[PDB]
Amino acid sequence: LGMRISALQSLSDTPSPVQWLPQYTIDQAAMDEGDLMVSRLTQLPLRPDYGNIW
Amino acid sequence: MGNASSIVQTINVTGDGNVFKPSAETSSTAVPSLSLSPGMLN
Amino acid sequence: MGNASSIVQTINVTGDGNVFKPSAETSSTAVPSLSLSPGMLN
Amino acid sequence: PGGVPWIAVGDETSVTSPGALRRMTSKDIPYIDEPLVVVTEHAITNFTKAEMALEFNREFLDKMRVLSVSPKYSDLLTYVDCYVGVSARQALNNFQKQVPVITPTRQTMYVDSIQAALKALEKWEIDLRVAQTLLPTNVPIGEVSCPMQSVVKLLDDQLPDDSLIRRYPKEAAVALAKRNGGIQWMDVSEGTVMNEAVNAVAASALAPSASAPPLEEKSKLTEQAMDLVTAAEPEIIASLAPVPAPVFAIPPKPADYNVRTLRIDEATWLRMIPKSMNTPFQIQVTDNTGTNWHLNLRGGTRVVNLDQIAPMRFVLDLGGKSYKETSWDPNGKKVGFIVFQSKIPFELWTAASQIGQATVVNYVQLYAEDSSFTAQSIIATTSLAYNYEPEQLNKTDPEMNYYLLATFIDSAAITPTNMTQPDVWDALLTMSPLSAGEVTVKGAVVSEVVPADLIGSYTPESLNASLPNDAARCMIDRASKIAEAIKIDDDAGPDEYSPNSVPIQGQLAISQLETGYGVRIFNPKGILSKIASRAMQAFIGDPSTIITQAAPVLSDKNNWIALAQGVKTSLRTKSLSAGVKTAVSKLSSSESIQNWTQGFLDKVSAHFPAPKPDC
Amino acid sequence: PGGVPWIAVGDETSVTSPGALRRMTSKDIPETAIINTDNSSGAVPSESALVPYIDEPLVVVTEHAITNFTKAEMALEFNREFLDKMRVLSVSPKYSDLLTYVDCYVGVSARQALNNFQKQVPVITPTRQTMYVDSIQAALKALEKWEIDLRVAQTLLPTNVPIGEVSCPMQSVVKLLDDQLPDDSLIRRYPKEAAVALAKRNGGIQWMDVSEGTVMNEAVNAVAASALAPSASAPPLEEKSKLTEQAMDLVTAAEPEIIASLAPVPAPVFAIPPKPADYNVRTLRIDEATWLRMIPKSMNTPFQIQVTDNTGTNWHLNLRGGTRVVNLDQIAPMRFVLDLGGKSYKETSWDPNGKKVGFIVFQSKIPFELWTAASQIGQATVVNYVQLYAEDSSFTAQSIIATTSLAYNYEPEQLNKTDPEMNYYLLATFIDSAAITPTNMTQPDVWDALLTMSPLSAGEVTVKGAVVSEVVPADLIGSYTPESLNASLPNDAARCMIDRASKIAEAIKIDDDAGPDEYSPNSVPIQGQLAISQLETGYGVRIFNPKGILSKIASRAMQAFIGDPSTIITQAAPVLSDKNNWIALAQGVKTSLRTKSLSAGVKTAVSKLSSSESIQNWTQGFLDKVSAHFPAP
Amino acid sequence: PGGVPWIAVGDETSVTSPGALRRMTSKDIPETAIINTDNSSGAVPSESALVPYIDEPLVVVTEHAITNFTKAEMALEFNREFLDKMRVLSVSPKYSDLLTYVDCYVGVSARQALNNFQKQVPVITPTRQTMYVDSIQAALKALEKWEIDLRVAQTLLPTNVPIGEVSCPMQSVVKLLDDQLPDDSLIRRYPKEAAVALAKRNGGIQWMDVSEGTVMNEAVNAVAASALAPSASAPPLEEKSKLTEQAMDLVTAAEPEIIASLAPVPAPVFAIPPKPADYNVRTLRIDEATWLRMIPKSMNTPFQIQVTDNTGTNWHLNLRGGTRVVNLDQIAPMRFVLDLGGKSYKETSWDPNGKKVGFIVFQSKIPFELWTAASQIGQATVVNYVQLYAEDSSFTAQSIIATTSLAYNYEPEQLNKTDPEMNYYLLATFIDSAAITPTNMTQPDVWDALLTMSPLSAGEVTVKGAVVSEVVPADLIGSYTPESLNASLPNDAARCMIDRASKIAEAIKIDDDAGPDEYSPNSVPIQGQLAISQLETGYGVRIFNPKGILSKIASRAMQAFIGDPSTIITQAAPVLSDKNNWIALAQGVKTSLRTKSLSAGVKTAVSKLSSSESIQNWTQGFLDKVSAHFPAP
């Protein structure tokens, strides 16, 4: 079973969500499957806070 | 083409016991070409 | 075919009853070549 | 199977029935519509092998984090029972069970994924090929050996700096071991070494054995010979009945001549004014733009008769000539092509009245330079060009004459005493055909040609004076292919009978036995075989001998037909074989190459010593 | 399986039993007789008196044949509509319905069949097979003009694009076709059938069903089209595979083992079809040409001799110092052609016009260099002769000789070559029926001309002007000077070696697209040899170069080889004069080709993609112009 | 399938990860070992001490390999009687008995095999495969002389006919064979075996069974022969398919998208193996030849100069007005060979016999035209030289120089090429160890000779005499006058394009048989472009033409292109000068070939049938003569 030998670093609990920057590969799929999976995994509907625009 | 491993290594490139013995029977081959004629593929 | 002989046990080359009749449909064939490409053979 | 799946729309169903069938779509396999197609087993196997080609390099792809899942072409197919065919009429008779079907979208996506992986693996494949070809890793016959440590040291020393092998050593080792069975890596955990190749079946076909050459290369050579014979088409080249020119002809080649040095009795396409006129005269001709030019016609002038030659292109080069007289200086002058259309034969011209219509179609200026000889100048290179196209020229009238001439032209009148040269035809002329659907025989076009009639009817002078689009040239070019085919097939030496030489011997024996006009002296089978072997060797040496007059035996058309027919049978009746001399020579050469490879590997091991174990 | 079916004549059956099997005929299986055939095609007559009753043999049909003949049926099925219009083959052939499935012994020979017992073996008769093939051929003969017209309709306007998409109003396309199609086209007479056929062939032509109002792709060749289509960032698999296949065929024809052998190789095996060669004997150098002999320019006493021809007539010719002849021995069968066109040969007391020149052959034991009298000529014969004609030339008051084609064939077997101390010489000069005064004609010979030699055999090879029965290919490397190669005979081994290496050069160029000073898998084999050689011990000053310099040198050498193949035999070539390098390259090329895996160069791929996009743009522009000039309603 | 078999490590019913699989070995399947091999061929020794006992790997056999290796044994079985005579392979190999069928995971890697569990997979060991191949090769080696003699026997007299049927007395045929076959033929030794073999091979030879008095066909290749046989009014499918395949191969090699691109293409991609070229420098014109430089005339004051060679020897040269040099910059690596045979170079105070000539290379910063003094030559070096010899010519009281070969290889890498102002030139002229008096020698140089120019690379392309990194093929159409083409360099893009378009020319000629003024699918694409162009509005007077005239013009243009491929680049070409027409034809060729369906030309078919009938009649006449002689008893 091929795995690197190392210990896990210990971190504190981040109190707020963290920004993420995705990266792409050469794999592909159809639009319909993407829409279907998003529909199955979505959390909508919900009522957000509008905030201020000006 | 050096090598170095930590703790253990199932294969050793620069170790002992490896065999380099080219032969006519073994040869060396890949997938160079295939038969994809339009009529025969259909 | 077969030049001269005199045995006449099973077939008689110099005897009667044989027919020599070439035609397009019969033709003449052997095993000249085969498909032995490395990619197809795998 | 093969085609598209169909579904019956009613209940009546016979071999011939109106309607009764429709295409099978996506909804009724158990949204937007797509059609369905039938996948053949040949396609399945080929695409599976395409997947295997990618899968050869799994260990590198894992490091690259690319292609986590294999394509698995077989998982995209759906199996149904229905009518299969290209047309409904065929489908009505062809009912099948468990046939695979797929959609074009999924097929395209699968092929695209494979192509993406193939592009991703390009640098890795190039590096692997470089590593394999750096040092000899394959031997024609036998075995060779060299320390793996020495080999690794040599590659470490000589590999390029940017090679991915340096960054990923182990993956390269596994990839090389999966392609070549001579490279084996010892398994440290259990201490065993073992072959890990995946192409033993393919290698067995490539491997020489016993005392015979490889089966695949023997078959390939025989296939190439048969392909050459097919491209030669002995039936067409040996017909005894007229054959259309568009069918008989092939792409021709340009030809070179010197008009002044040619003989009139040898060239039927030249017309010369008799040298007994001794009365030069002057004429004027208007070019296409409207400019008027002056030129002279004297006894001895030669023109080209354009009526019978097919579409042609003429190029004239004056380089290296003198054309200098006491009262005439070529430098700064002009030359050109003049075309005449007249109702009077060219030999009867004696005045300006008979010229008929005339036109200067092209012209160039001349420049001169000093030559090797002292006090002599030569004209620089010239490329005067003209295209003869018969379609424009009005050919409806059946008594018109068309001539082509090249001479000195000038805006001013030329005094006959100043220039005494009949023309400027003493130069190099290049003729190139402009249409491949016409054939000429000794200077005239013919709609039909008998290939067997051409045999043994040309003198060397006639062949030299033939036009570029002559039938003899096409015959020679076609016979050439059989020449290479026979040479590939046979390896016979001098005075050795062959299957490709026996038919001539049979024809000679029959002709000798035949009784006719002239005394006969009998010759044995040995002498006949010797003559046949020499004839075949001469034909292979020079294919043009067949059309030459008074050839030794090849002038006889019976021998030519017999040979042309017998080559087909000789090639077709072979059974995976090769010549004995060829086999022994290949064996000896392969052994020599093996010795050379072993010596080289010994040198490598000497100059890159392996560490000495001390256990 | 394959072969013929057998039945067991006796109870005992072993793998080597003697005389146990006999052929299976039509009597054993009645439903294979012609009287029981499925006459849906209608070939067999319905009259009883017209059907014969004779026994027929049986043969086994293989799966390859079954599949290929089914594909041949589909070839016909592509054009059913016109077949229906012509009332031909109302019922499909269905090759599977002519076969009978039997369990028996199958094999080419009885010995093989004794070990091979199979079940459900399809068998057929020659007459039925001929009937099936004849039906297919008749239908294909029928569809000729329809096929031609359909191809014309498809190729009149751009119908395929290398990459991407194009579009145009279908009404505009139809109007253009109606405008430009020939008068006699069947497409005009039968539009609907052409539309259906084109919808079958091409997936980009779609017709709407008026009843249901739907459009849909109707092609039947999507699988083949997918392999023929260029995917994003990659050339077609068909193209890549075909190019690699052609390269491997070129190398197989080039035959690396023979072209790189270090051991003697027979001349008939090594030889290949040769080509003619041209020379001028007068301007040749005797120290460089070994097949010429010359009388020393010191004898200084021309002498007159008389010769006879085959017909028996007598001629006179004069021999003086400086005369040149060709040593006929050791040069193999050959054909000589002499042309005197353009020369002058004009002297104060000699007029070439009207004179005759001919070929003369001498046989003597006395060597040529010692000839001083007529007694030493031996046996002389005039083989051929031609008369001459003169015509004015470009130079004033200068008459040159018209073109000539004097021919001769040297065949050694026609000569008596038993005596070892016999010499054979060939001469060309003026001949005359009357004595020629030496003062009048002073030219030694007429060798100042153009001579073309063609080999008369393909089983003999020469080296440096002399025939050798045995050749060592690797030892010819780097042993020829340019002048030696120029003076070489047409059947020299060097020319054959160059021609064979040309195929390797073409294969490398096909496989490679590397630019200047860039390493290649076909260039590293030379680099390895150079690296080993520079470390090898020898005599002289040692120079050490790194791997980059070695790779650059190897790339330059490979490019030089591809540019000119004669460099391998040219003396003192930079790198290609080393037999080790030559052998390494020859062996490495084969492995480099065999180790490819459906690949193409990055430069080639990107260039192909750019070119395809440009062609797509051009096609779109043309279609836009067509739509503009043929408006839709 | 294909690849290698895999098995679960340790426990089963637990295969969820690739790490749980390992390659299967002969230890897991004992009946694949050597000891369990069925030794019906006797290859494996029967001594227990000589049989190895080790573990071995396993591989998967594909059905294509199975079929081909099974069909391989048919070659042996065609000659079983002689095999029995030589006591070789008493038992047939029977490839299928060497395989073992198991159920396992099939793949090349563990990840692939994880999802590819299959049943009844055939596996084999390399040792057993090699044994089988060795047995086949041993039999083939044994049957060599037998096969040669059999082919001789079949080919000595006609045994096949293109069409129809012929007959002749078998007794007369046997008498002819007895009279003509060689003494050492194995046929004389074994008559009956030859008869059986030929009966197997050819269906036209039949032997009557004496006891039962029956005669019948025993051929075993009826199915294969049916494809070769030409049906009535139709050529063979074999020939049709082969010709179409060859044409498609030619087009694929010709690379239509490369030869028709509209965007820049890299020189290494575009280039192909070049050919040598010939020139005469003295007779060229400077305006056309952009790589020549001349010292302007009227300079009329020659100056002497001294140059040292590589060894150190000094030489003297004279430079006057009218001397020409070759600009060695921007012409790619190349090789020059110069020959002065046939010239005179004779003056009152200069005799060429015994003199020396050579190549001199100058590096300087001053343009060559402004050279007037020795100080303006920069650096100079004599790179090669040769001595001359003279011999009398056809012209009275004149002599000419013998054939010479002076060679020089220009490679830019060796030269520094570091300063942008540096100028490089090449010059050939008389050189002497002593000073040359300017009055004695008056010729500017020795360039009045023959120059052979050969590229030394295949990655560089020159246009009009200058190297370019990339070339746009679409702009080379109709941009070359004959003078420019003649004066062009050997490595020009025009020659490469001509060679590439040649292949398209042979492909079109192969697949077309149209006569004069006959439309073709390969000629209509030009017609479409012509129609659209004449419909286009633009500058100039427009004249409307009918579709028949357009078709005739297109057909003539295609015929011209087939006749001479070089017309596409010639300036002012009639119809081929248009890039639109060229691109249309190049793109339409692929569709025209790919849309064919086992078809052939009508004229071709009629001619083929007529020719076949004529050949059949000739064969029947020959057989009649053979029967007239050797009379039957």
Numbering used by the authors:
A (entry chain J): 377 to 430
B (entry chain E), C (entry chain A): 1 to 42
D (entry chain H): 43 to 72, 95 to 679
E (entry chain F), F (entry chain B): 43 to 675
Which of the paper's sentences describe this entry?
The transcription enzyme complex (TEC) is comprised of λ3 and μ2 and is attached inside the inner layer. Asymmetric sub-particle reconstruction yielded near-atomic resolution (up to 3.0 Å) structures for five types of viral particles, all with visible side chain densities for atomic model building: from 6 h post-infection, core, virion, empty core, and empty virion were reconstructed; and for 48 h post-infection, structures of virion, empty virion, and outer shell particle were obtained. Inside the particle, reconstructions of virion and core particles clearly show that the layered RNA genome and densities of TEC (at red arrows) are underneath the inner shell, indicating that genome replication from ssRNA to dsRNA has been completed in the core. However, an asymmetric reconstruction of the TEC was obtained after focused classification in virions only, not in the empty virion. This result suggests that the RNA genome is important for stable docking of TEC to the inner layer protein shell, though it is not required for TEC incorporation into the capsid, as also suggested by the tomograms. The λ2 pentameric turret changes conformation during virus assembly: in the core, the turret is open, with a central channel 75 Å in diameter; in the virion, it closes, sealing off the channel. As the proteins μ1/σ3 coat the core to form the outer layer of the virion, the last two of the three Ig-like domains, acting as a rigid body, flip down 46° to close the channel, which is then sealed by σ1 attachment. Studies have shown that assembled core particles in the condensates are active in mRNA transcription, but this activity is inhibited after outer layer proteins μ1/σ3 and σ1 are incorporated to form virion particles. Our structural data align with these functional findings: in the core, the open conformation of the turret maximally facilitates mRNA export efficiency, while in the virion, the closed conformation of the turret suppresses transcription, leading to a virion in the quiescent state. The coating of outer layer proteins μ1, σ3, and σ1 occurs continuously throughout capsid formation and completes the virion particles, which eventually egress from the cell.
